[PDB]
């Protein structure tokens, strides 16, 4: 009664069900920022190339340490030198850190509020904790940030719209980049009226420091736990970020594949109970959502407990309808309680995930953004349903991997919270997309036992009647036509699942 359907023990998991990884190597579609010949378990990766190479152009990250990162001083000065002078001062009071960050962000000295930072340091932390923050954690964060040019020696390409491309970098490289984001050093990522990066998420952390939300101290404690850990002892693994764009989507009405298997449960979570499975991130199209600002639901929580996810925001352009982002190897650094306005940092987490042959933790997460529905009936429009199917399919599909090497998809109430979707429709949409990609589904209803029973009952009804993906999608089209298209009322007369049962049983 806590779970229904296929036992979870019968589902596929990594590393055990994967194909042997090819040799890690750079190519036209795979950027690798470390020495693959020198990659060894338990050893910090050596950057490749050995010495910094800079690109300052429209296809790459604009690094803070670039010699083309200038500031009008009536003449040009080196912003990297300015950052060095600003950050290498000792901090004893939160005003010190604010003044430091603003030295190289002068145009934002009246726009960026630091109230949350000041309050965290002065009004949440005990004296000993504040002292540890400014005597140890912050100066260590400064040093790894300022080592950037020795750590990230290779230009990082932007994962731009329509690119099918991967970047594999070390956890150490990510820590240095994230310390930079914390100190707000990334240029051209700040103007509200910016052109080049308007289609990219926020990366600099300035909005984490604003206002008086009671959740800011919990975000900051979660992030400082990470920074403490990665500056005290350099992490040794790698992380891969892959942008995936599909060209041909299924003719859904015509799909003759059968449904796959389902485990559905009202207990557990994606991140704890989906080990070795493709874990779904219920994303915003600007990946990470409000992680560095006010957001604190499913995506922001995952980005906080696995902060290596946050660096996706540096190089991942806003997802189009046919796109996703697949992140392999992020490490869990914190545990938490609650959710949204009750979210709290609990303690440091020791990740026991095994690493694959590329020294990546065996944790695969896919960012797929649902549509945000403002009116209930909107989501039943065929175009919108087909959009959600194609999005999930893109997230689930692994071109040229066979089904027996695909783990189950660990998912849940995608789009049915901040984004207003109907869980029962979305559940069926995910089940169809999983079918077409030939993966099983492990579905966590996050405490809703009725929804568990309902998803289970519908799935077994459809499976026992041998209804194909196409048969089911056609029933969704019928529901729209009979109950939604000509409905002038906000909510239809008959619900989806009852409609389906009656339509199938009536034929
Ligand atoms: N750990 C979890 N495991 C399983 N299910 C979960 C978990 N956490 C939450 N749920 C369930 O999943 C439901 C939906 O989680 P939501 O986070 O609202 O995702 P959306 O797709 O609707 O909104 C995405 C936007 O919100 C963010 O800001 C993004 O950046 C986007 O801007 C919850 O109501 C729970 O029932």
State yes or no: is 300 an active-site residue.
Answer: yes
State yes or no: is 299 an active-site residue.
Answer: yes
Report CA(416)–ligand 1 centroid distance (Å): 7
- Return contacts of 212-216, CB within 8 angstroms, 24+ apart: 212/115, 212/116, 212/119, 213/116, 213/294, 214/341, 215/294, 215/296, 215/341, 215/343, 216/116, 216/119, 216/120
Tokens of 209: 């420091």
Q: Is the CB of 18 under 6 A from ligand 1?
A: no
| Alpha helices (runs of H) in 326-443, residue ranges in sequence order | 382-396, 423-436
Provide the sign of the torsion angle of the four alpha carbons 224, 39, 165, 17, taken in this order.
negative
Q: Which residue range is the domain that position 251 belongs to?
A: 1-507
> Counting beta carbons within 10 angstroms of the beta carbon of residue 462, is it exposed (0 to 12), middle (13 to 18) or buried (19 or more)?
buried
Q: Is the CB of 446 under 6 A from ligand 1?
A: yes
Active-site residue, selected from the candidate residues 202, 218, 300, 331: 300
C-alpha 465: how far from its chain's center?
A: 37
Neighbouring residues of 415: CB distance < 8 A, sequence distance ≥ 6: 282, 370, 371, 372, 373, 388, 421, 426
Neighbouring residues of 486: CB distance < 8 A, sequence distance ≥ 6: none
> With the CA atoms of 27, 32, 35 and 40 taken in that order, what torsion angle do they form, in degrees rounded to the nearest 10?
-110
| Rounded distance between C-alpha atoms, residue 354 and residue 249, angstroms | 34
Report CA(220)–ligand 1 centroid distance (Å): 21
Stated in angstroms to one decimal place, the resolution of this structure is 2.0
Give me the number of domains the chain comprises. Answer: 1
Q: Is the CB of 416 under 6 A from ligand 1?
A: yes
Angle at 41 between CA 38 and CA 44, to 5 degrees: 60
Identify each DSSP E strand in 143-197 by its residue range. Answer: 165-170
> Counting beta carbons within 10 angstroms of the beta carbon of residue 488, is it exposed (0 to 12), middle (13 to 18) or buried (19 or more)?
exposed
| Alpha helices (runs of H) in 195-279, residue ranges in sequence order | 216-232, 270-273
Q: Which one, of 404, 410, 182, lies nearest residue 307 by Cα?
A: 182
Identify each DSSP E strand in 107-193 by its residue range. Answer: 165-170
Atom of ligand 1 nearest to the CA of 444: 4
Atom of ligand 1 nearest to the CA of 296: 28
Q: Is the CB of 420 under 6 A from ligand 1?
A: no
Q: Which residues pair with 170 in a beta bridge?
A: 238
Tokens of 262: 């389902």
Active-site residue, selected from the candidate residues 299, 331, 369, 454: 299
Structure determined by: X-ray
H/E run at residue 345: strand 344-348
- 278-283 β-sheet, strand order: 3-5, 262-265, 441-444, 409-412, 278-283, 364-369, 323-328, 238-245, 165-170, 30-32
3-state secondary structure of 354: coil
Q: Which one, of 477, 455, 270, 237, lies nearest residue 356 by Cα?
A: 237
C-beta separation of 10 from 407 below 8 A: no
State yes or no: is 67 an active-site residue.
Answer: no
| Rounded distance between C-alpha atoms, residue 230 and residue 240, angstroms | 18
> Measuring CA to CA, how many Å separate 189 from each of 82, 294, 399, 446?
18, 18, 34, 36
């Amino acid at each position: 009664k806590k779970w229904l359907g296929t036992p979870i023990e019968e589902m596929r998991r990594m590393p055990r069900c994967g194909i042997r990884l090819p040799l890690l190597r750079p190519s036209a579609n795979h950027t690798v920022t470390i020495r693959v010949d020198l990659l060894r378990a338990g050893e910090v990766p050596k950057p490749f190339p050995t010495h910094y190479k800079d690109l300052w152009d429209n296809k790459h990250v604009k690094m803070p340490c670039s010699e083309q990162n200038l500031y009008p001083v009536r003449t040009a000065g080196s912003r990297w030198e300015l950052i060095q002078t600003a950050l290498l001062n000792k901090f004893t009071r939160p005003q010190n850190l604010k003044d430091a960050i603003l030295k190289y962000n002068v145009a934002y000295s009246k726009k960026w509020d630091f109230t949350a930072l000041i309050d965290f340091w002065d009004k949440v932390l005990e004296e000993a904790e504040a002292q540890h923050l400014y005597q140890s954690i912050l100066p260590d964060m400064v040093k790894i940030a300022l080592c950037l040019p020795n750590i990230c020696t290779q230009p990082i390409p932007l994962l731009a719209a329509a690119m099918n491309h991967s970047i594999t970098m070390s956890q150490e490289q990510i820590a240095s980049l994230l310390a930079n984001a914390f100190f707000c050093t990334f240029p051209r990522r700040n103007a509200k009226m910016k052109s080049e990066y308007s289609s990219y998420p926020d990366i600099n952390f300035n909005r984490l420091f604003e206002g008086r939300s009671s959740r800011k101290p919990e975000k900051l404690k979660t992030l400082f736990c990470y920074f403490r850990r990665v500056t005290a002892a350099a992490p040794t693994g790698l992380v891969t970020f892959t942008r995936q764009s599909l060209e041909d989507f299924p003719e859904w009405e015509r799909c003759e594949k059968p449904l796959t298997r389902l485990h559905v449960t009202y207990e557990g979570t994606i991140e704890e109970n989906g080990q070795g499975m493709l874990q779904v991130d219920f994303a915003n199209r600007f990946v990470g959502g409000g992680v560095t600002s006010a957001g604190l639901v499913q995506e922001e929580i995952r980005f906080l407990i696995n902060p290596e996810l946050i660096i996706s925001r540096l190089f991942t352009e806003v997802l189009d309808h046919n796109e996703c982002l697949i992140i392999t190897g992020t490490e869990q650094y914190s545990e938490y309680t609650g959710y949204a306005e009750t979210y709290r940092w609990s303690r440091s987490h020791e990740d026991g995930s095994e690493r694959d042959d590329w020294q990546r933790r065996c944790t695969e997460i896919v960012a797929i953004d649902a549509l945000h529905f403002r009116r209930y009936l909107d989501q039943f429009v065929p175009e919108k349903m087909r959009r959600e199917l194609n999005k999930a399919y893109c997230g689930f599909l692994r071109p040229g991997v066979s089904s027996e090497n695909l783990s189950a998809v660990a998912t849940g109430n995608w789009g049915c919270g901040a984004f207003g979707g109907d869980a029962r429709l979305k559940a069926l949409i995910q089940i169809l997309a999983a079918a077409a990609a030939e993966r099983d589904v492990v579905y966590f209803t996050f405490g809703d036992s009725e929804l568990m029973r309902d998803i289970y009952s519908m799935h077994i009804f459809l499976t026992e009647r041998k209804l194909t993906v196409g048969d089911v999608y056609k029933l969704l089209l019928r529901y729209y036509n009979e109950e939604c298209r000509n409905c002038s009322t906000p909510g239809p007369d008959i619900k989806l699942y009852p409609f389906i049962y009656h339509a199938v049983e009536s034929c």
